[PDB]
């Protein structure tokens, strides 16, 4: 169990696949601009409550979503319609991230957590259209929520959900998170529900989708 709340580059594991690297940049977006971006994205983004599938069952995801990019992204057995026209603010942020981080992106997934009851549960971003060892950038706006990470068990332990290394990363207003290396191969992450009032949170997840 590790807690990370300091600006820095953290190598969270070195095996089995390789180096798992996460980079945190608090205050990447200044408070007032982040406030305005939040208001703007809450009003302008075409937010929808989408369906999931699981295993021959149907349910409403406990979060709103929207997609931007020229290529489709299919998770939870449902495909999101790619949007060719990026919102100008989203473009600007994309370009800012690229120039400052040195990594390029062509796809953006928008998550809106309406209140404390919204969440995304355990998964890895290992969809094959992301390629081998994808680079994923996460930018947060609104209320603070906790980004939890758990290391995957090795195949000898038959997927033991417990006792493996856990990491919690608070994502505050205007904080930028970068994930690279083996992070998607070796770790899972989620955003749990909370038990006290939370204001809405908008999260921007940038990635590269390949043919």
């Amino acid at each position, epitope marked *: 169990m590790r807690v990370i709340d300091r600006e820095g580059v953290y190598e969270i594991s070195l095996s089995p696949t390789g180096v798992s690297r996460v980079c945190l940049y608090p205050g990447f977006v*200044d*408070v*007032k*601009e982040a406030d*305005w*971006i939040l*208001e*703007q994205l809450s*009003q*302008d983004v075409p937010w929808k409550q989408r369906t999931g599938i699981r295993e021959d069952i149907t349910y409403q995801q406990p979060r709103l979503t929207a997609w931007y990019g020229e290529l489709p992204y299919t998770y939870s057995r449902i495909t999101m319609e790619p949007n060719p*026209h990026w*919102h*100008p*603010v989203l473009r*600007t942020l994309k370009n800012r991230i690229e120039e400052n981080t040195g990594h390029t992106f062509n796809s953006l997934l928008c998550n809106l957590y309406r209140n404390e009851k919204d969440s995304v549960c355990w998964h890895s971003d290992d969809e094959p259209s992301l390629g081998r060892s994808p680079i994923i950038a996460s930018l947060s706006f609104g209320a603070t929520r906790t980004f939890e990470m758990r290391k995957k068990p090795p195949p000898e332990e038959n997927g033991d959900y417990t006792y493996v290394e856990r990491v919690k990363i608070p994502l505050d207003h205007g904080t930028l998170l970068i994930m690279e290396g083996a992070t998607q191969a070796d770790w899972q992450h989620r955003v749990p529900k909370e038990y006290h009032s939370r204001e809405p949170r908008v999260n921007l997840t940038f990635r590269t989708v390949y043919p």
Partner: antibody
Amino acid sequence: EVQLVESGGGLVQPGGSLRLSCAASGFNFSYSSIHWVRQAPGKGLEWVAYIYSSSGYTSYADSVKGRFTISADTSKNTAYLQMNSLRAEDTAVYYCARGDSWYAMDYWGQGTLVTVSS
Amino acid sequence: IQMTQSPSSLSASVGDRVTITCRASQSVSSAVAWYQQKPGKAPKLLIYSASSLYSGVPSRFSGSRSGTDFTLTISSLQPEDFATYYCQQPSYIYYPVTFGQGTKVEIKR
């Protein structure tokens, strides 16, 4: 009673310069957007620049870029506009307007006259 | 050489319903502001966020959005409502701001 006062306007030769100032009275700057809008006699409004006082970000109009320089001093609660290489078409009434949000301007000044002519 | 245009005119009587439209194609935002300016005075803010009334604005003014078209409607024309109305086009964050063609509303005689 929360007014805005503009100063630094007058008469200048083409290619000359001016420095407009916008003093915030009754309230404060910071965590707000400071806009400059001009209006030629009998014409429509023309936004020329704004600045986000919290971070310092600035954006200018295409008919102004390179020549003007907008700034703000939280220490003095005063916005500035350094207008260089002034041209004849720059003659207009210049307004300074606040704007809680990033666009909605709620406090406007009375405006000062700027005449660029030989 | 001119930068902007002269405001268009609209002849209306007292009590009529006036609906001024503001076209902005390819718009994907609701951040449209409306302003009113009387002769010789600075403009005052009327509507922000396309439809939200500003503090101290009469309830007869109302703004709505229809796709890429934005509108400002006066339900009942009052004598103090005859002035020029300017539409601020969708102002995205980090991007420049543009004011539309003013609409001069004069009283019929």
